[PDB]
Amino acid sequence: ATIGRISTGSKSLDKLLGGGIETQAITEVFGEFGSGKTQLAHTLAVMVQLPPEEGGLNGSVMWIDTENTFRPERIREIAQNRGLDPDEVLKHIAYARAFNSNHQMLLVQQAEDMIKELLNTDRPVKLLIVDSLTSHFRSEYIGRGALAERQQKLAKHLADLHRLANLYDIAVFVTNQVSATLRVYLRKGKGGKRIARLIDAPHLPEGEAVFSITEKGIED
Ligand SMILES: COC(=O)[C@@H](N)Cc1c[nH]c2ccccc12
Numbered sequence: 001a002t003i004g005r006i007s008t009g010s011k012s013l014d015k016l017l018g019g020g021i022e023t024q025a026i027t028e029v030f031g032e033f034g035s036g037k038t039q040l041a042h043t044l045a046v047m048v049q050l051p052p053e054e055g056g057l058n059g060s061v062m063w064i065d066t067e068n069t070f071r072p073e074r075i076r077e078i079a080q081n082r083g084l085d086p087d088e089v090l091k092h093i094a095y096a097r098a099f100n101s102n103h104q105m106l107l108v109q110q111a112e113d114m115i116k117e118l119l120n121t122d123r124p125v126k127l128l129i130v131d132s133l134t135s136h137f138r139s140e141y142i143g144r145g146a147l148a149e150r151q152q153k154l155a156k157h158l159a160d161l162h163r164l165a166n167l168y169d170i171a172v173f174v175t176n177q178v179s180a181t182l183r184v185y186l187r188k189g190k191g192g193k194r195i196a197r198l199i200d201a202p203h204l205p206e207g208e209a210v211f212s213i214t215e216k217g218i219e220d
Helices: 011-016 037-047 072-081 086-091 101-118 135-140 144-168
Strands: 025-030 060-065 093-097 125-131 171-176 182-188 194-199 207-214 217-219
Touching (some): 025 037, 037 125, 037 217, 093 101, 101 125, 101 144, 135 144
Antiparallel strands (some): 182 194, 194 207, 207 217
16 A cells, blocks of 8 residues: 555644654654653554545554553543534544553554454554553663563563554554654753754655644644
8 A cells, every 4th residue: 555644733743744644653752851742653643544645544542552642631621722623533543551561562563453353444553552561661671681672572572562563554653761663752942942853764865854743733
């Protein structure tokens, strides 16, 4: 399938990314607390539900939450400020809490069932979020005796995610803190604005985009 793109809500950020986040890819967004990475996650979970002319892919969402950062009220707000129905938007976000790293990996494995179910419907899964990719791994695998297994498990996890992205034409979006992935680093700019920097993209130039966080989520 042709690669599809989901608008981030920000024209600047979309430009940096070549149009938006890609299906058949993992986009990995790094940032410190308050950087905007989870806000971007929330915005994408709304945008993807729009038609292409509006920057979406008429898709459903699956959201794996490792540290209780998903806010249904923020989804409703973003939806409403974008002229959407907050109840319908929330209904098309399948939510799963991951309690630990094993469970997180299991949830990605299990997600394929729902992806298959929705695949040839009016609302196929088009966005799979893992927020965050590494919190459990960092918490559980401490020190050098643990690094080998941590890296192995994480590698397997990323491979499972790539497979779903490629096989089912889904944009995978994961958050992290400091191929395989398209890496974007968020930082604080001036006057409350945020800055995204794209690094080490094989086929997009490095660059920066300045964006805002508003009642619409992310936008210029
Ligand atoms: C196949 O999907 C399901 O059976 C969902 N009822 C539970 C689930 C599994 N993995 C997930 C990932 C994200 C959100 C929900 C889930």
